[PDB]
Amino acid sequence: NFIGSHMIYTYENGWEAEIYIKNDHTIDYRIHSGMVAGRWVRDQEVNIVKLTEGVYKVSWTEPTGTDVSLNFMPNEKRMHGIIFFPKWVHEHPEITVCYQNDHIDLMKESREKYETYPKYVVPEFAEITFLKNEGVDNEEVISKAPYEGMTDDIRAGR
Amino acid sequence: ENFIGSHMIYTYENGWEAEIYIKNDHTIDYRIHSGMVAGRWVRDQEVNIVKLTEGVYKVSWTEPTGTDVSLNFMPNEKRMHGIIFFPKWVHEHPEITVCYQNDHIDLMKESREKYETYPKYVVPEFAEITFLKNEGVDNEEVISKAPYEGMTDDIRAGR
Numbered sequence A: 001n002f003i004g005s006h007m008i009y010t011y012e013n014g015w016e017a018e019i020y021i022k023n024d025h026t027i028d029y030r031i032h033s034g035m036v037a038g039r040w041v042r043d044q045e046v047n048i049v050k051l052t053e054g055v056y057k058v059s060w061t062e063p064t065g066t067d068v069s070l071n072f073m074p075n076e077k078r079m080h081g082i083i084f085f086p087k088w089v090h091e092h093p094e095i096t097v098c099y100q101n102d103h104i105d106l107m108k109e110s111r112e113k114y115e116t117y118p119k120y121v122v123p124e125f126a127e128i129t130f131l132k133n134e135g136v137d138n139e140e141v142i143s144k145a146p147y148e149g150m151t152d153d154i155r156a157g158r
Numbered sequence B: 001e002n003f004i005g006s007h008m009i010y011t012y013e014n015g016w017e018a019e020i021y022i023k024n025d026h027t028i029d030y031r032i033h034s035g036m037v038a039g040r041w042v043r044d045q046e047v048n049i050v051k052l053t054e055g056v057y058k059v060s061w062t063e064p065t066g067t068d069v070s071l072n073f074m075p076n077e078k079r080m081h082g083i084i085f086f087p088k089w090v091h092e093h094p095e096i097t098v099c100y101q102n103d104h105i106d107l108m109k110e111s112r113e114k115y116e117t118y119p120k121y122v123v124p125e126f127a128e129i130t131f132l133k134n135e136g137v138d139n140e141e142v143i144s145k146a147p148y149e150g151m152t153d154d155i156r157a158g159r
């Protein structure tokens, strides 16, 4: 049961992110802190694979031009992520902050408008600090913008 | 672990055959032997290398072409997985990238500005590792010539 998993983790650089593996090919996610705290995304098509017993890999590309490849080892409460940010997302991360689904064309208009190279690459580990299977296609799991303290509320059950 | 120094050849399920040499904890060389971009070879590519668990590793990086790569290797299981994020133009005009990159880095940069980037062409595949020899560290000769038809066999055999 890896699909359906709902995790919160904290990258070694202090960023706190939340992902929900909704399908074998779809995720939702929320960013709670860091350069781009506030951003949240739903129905992001993704490549999900099992690499071995215990290890998984969720990778995809964004309407922003950002390319992501996450590896999860939940048994070990650990994961690794590498994010390839187009220059402009580093310069102007605030553009990307919103509920993406409502403004997809904005992200596309933006990645053409602003500069792409050199990319800003963030490769970090993270500690998983929450893991609850919510079953498959559970649309309510990630359904509101993040707010200060939300991660605690989730972890507390509150 | 004793993963640095490794020299592997593998074949992606889409039929592409590639060759990598893990030269350092932060550097690779590589050769592409078939597929859309057969002929391409690269040296001293800075990379992010990590151990994720016992047996599993991850080499990821970005190219002067704009291509972003994240490879996972599980050598014990003679298997690996790769995802490659190609800028549109590399899919349209892969021949540009077919080069000893080091001699023409600025070409790649001039190109990724000149041509279109979006939508990207994403290739996420498994591959079977068909060769694995540790060649120790900073062995500069391991990958030192452009690939030729049959080269992978020659390596696997002995020449």
Ligand SMILES: O=C(O)/C=C/c1ccc(O)cc1
Residues within 6 Å of the ligand: A017, A018, A019, A029, A031, A036, A039, A064, A066, A068, A070, A081, A083, A089, A096
């Ligand atoms: O959770 C991750 O691994 C990456 C999250 C992310 C959120 C917004 C971005 O613009 C890029 C990455």
Ligand SMILES: O=C(O)/C=C/c1ccc(O)cc1
Residues within 6 Å of the ligand: B018, B019, B020, B030, B032, B037, B040, B065, B067, B069, B082, B084, B090, B097
């Ligand atoms: O898997 C590898 O070792 C290299 C892949 C690759 C894909 C596109 C390129 O333009 C160069 C290398």
